Design a protein around this ligand. Structure first.
Ligand SMILES: OC[C@H]1O[C@H](OCC#Cc2cccnc2)[C@@H](O)[C@@H](O)[C@@H]1O
Length: 158
C-alpha cells in the first residue's frame, strides 16, 4: 500500500508525509461553498491484493490559516459528510486492487459572515488530512499525512 499525488510525489509503503498544492475557486461568496476535491489529487493502491485487503480511513482532518478563521466546513468521505475539522475517524474504504484509486475526500468550506476580503492566501496551509491504513493481514497501521496548500488567493466579495 502506497499513495501518490497528481503531480507525481509519492508516499511509499509504511507511510509518511507529503505536500499537496491545489487550485482554489478564486472568488467565493459568504454562504456558498468553496469545494476542495482531493479525489483528483490523491491516489492509492494495494500492493498485494491476492492476499491482503487494505483499509483506509480519514483519521483526522485539520484546518489552518485562512480556512480556520474565515470558513465553516464539512468534509465528505466517500460521499458521506462529517464536521471539518473532524471530530472522529471515518469508516474505512476498501483498497483491494493495484489500480490507482482516488482517496475519496472533499472539503466543503463556506465563508462565514465575517469573511470578506482575501480569505485564504496563496501558499498557505489550509488543511492537514491524515490517511490511516491498516489491513486484514498483519499489525500494519500507517499514517499518510497530506499537507494541503492553496495555490492562489481566495477572495470573498464585500
Ligand atoms: O497493500 C498491501 C500491503 O502492501 C505492503 O505489504 C506488501 C507485502 C507483503 C507480504 C509478502 C509476502 C508475505 N506476506 C506479506 C504494505 O504496505 C502493507 O501494509 C499492505 O497491507
Amino acid at each position: 500500500f502506497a499513495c501518490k499525488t497528481a503531480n507525481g510525489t509519492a508516499i511509499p509503503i509504511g507511510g509518511g508525509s507529503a505536500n499537496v498544492y491545489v487550485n482554489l475557486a478564486p472568488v467565493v461568496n459568504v454562504g456558498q461553498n468553496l469545494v476542495v476535491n482531493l479525489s483528483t489529487q490523491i491516489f492509492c493502491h494495494n500492493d498485494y491484493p491476492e492476499t491482503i485487503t487494505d483499509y483506509v480511513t480519514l483519521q483526522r482532518g485539520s484546518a489552518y490559516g485562512g480556512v480556520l478563521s474565515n470558513f465553516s466546513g464539512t468534509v465528505k468521505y466517500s460521499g458521506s459528510s462529517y464536521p471539518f475539522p473532524t471530530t472522529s475517524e471515518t469508516p474505512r474504504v476498501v483498497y483491494n486492487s493495484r489500480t490507482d484509486k482516488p482517496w475519496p475526500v472533499a472539503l466543503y468550506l463556506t465563508p462565514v459572515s465575517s469573511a470578506g476580503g482575501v480569505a485564504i492566501k496563496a501558499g498557505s496551509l489550509i488543511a492537514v488530512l491524515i490517511l490511516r491504513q491498516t489491513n486484514n493481514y498483519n499489525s500494519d497501521d500507517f499514517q499518510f499525512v497530506w499537507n494541503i496548500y492553496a495555490n492562489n488567493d481566495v477572495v470573498v466579495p464585500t
